[PDB]
Symmetry: D3
Subunit: 29 residues, 6 copies
């Protein structure tokens, strides 16, 4: 029960990291 | 371009909040 | 003990989501 | 406008860090 | 200036994702 | 095992808070 929840959390933070990379790329461009 | 990225980020943090509420409920139970 | 801490964490991430929505709205405007 | 929003975000993440330290201390104890 | 900061942020969230995966693995085990 | 992981997480969120303060300062300037 707890394991999957923390896995869903790790996945959400990876999507967040992706979004901030995107943002970084939009600024440079 | 930037607006939607930050919106996608706000959505990810809301899913994260949901997950930690879930976790909180799993502990109590 | 642990439950409330994770609840305080879920609340903080919801405030964070709100802030990024705000930011998104400030960019568009 | 944007500056204060990111400041409110930095403050929220510091409260989050505090909460996870708390959690870490509750586990050890 | 801003680009690198958001890149440093994306990197921090990836380390966070790693940590929660670790945690998930510690629970199962 | 779990304690140190959550400590590493609290440290990552403090670095994140620092980065958003930086960003806030870059906007004002
Ligand atoms: Cl736990
Ligand atoms: Cl910006």
């Amino acid at each position: 029960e707890l394991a999957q929840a923390f896995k869903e959390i790790a996945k959400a933070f990876k999507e967040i990291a992706k979004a901030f990379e995107f943002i970084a790329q939009a600024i440079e461009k």
